[PDB]
Amino acid sequence: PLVKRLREQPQNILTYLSISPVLSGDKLLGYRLNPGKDASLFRQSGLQANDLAIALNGIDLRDQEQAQQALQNLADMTEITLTVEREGQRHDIAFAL
Ligand SMILES: CCCCCC/C=C\CCCCCCCCCC(=O)O
Numbered sequence: 001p002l003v004k005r006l007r008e009q010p011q012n013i014l015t016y017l018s019i020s021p022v023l024s025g026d027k028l029l030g031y032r033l034n035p036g037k038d039a040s041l042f043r044q045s046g047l048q049a050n051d052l053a054i055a056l057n058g059i060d061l062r063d064q065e066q067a068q069q070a071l072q073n074l075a076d077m078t079e080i081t082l083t084v085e086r087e088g089q090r091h092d093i094a095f096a097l
Helices: 002-006 064-074
Strands: 017-024 027-035 051-056 079-086 089-096
Touching (some): 002 017, 002 064
Antiparallel strands (some): 017 027, 027 051, 051 079, 079 089
């Protein structure tokens, strides 16, 4: 699963984020995000509680093979962008790694 795979990164991503896939029927809607033990990324121009992650570096997280590709690619990246849906609207947030 994607969460179990994010745990391999030297950045302690799961210290900053609590993540659950969101299912509807046979569809994955995205990944629901909330603060980890360190809530630093949650701020006005950053993430919000209950944001829905739908893309990583422009790759659709809802599509299983694409998401796999996006995750293998995060390994040697220096800055990554997350697209979230928040009360109907998309927002892009970048993170320095
Ligand atoms: C659903 C897929 C979610 C993947 C999201 C990854 C998002 C953010 C990574 C945040 C890393 C934050 C700390 C990076 C290491 C150094 C930064 C610091 O000084 O804390």
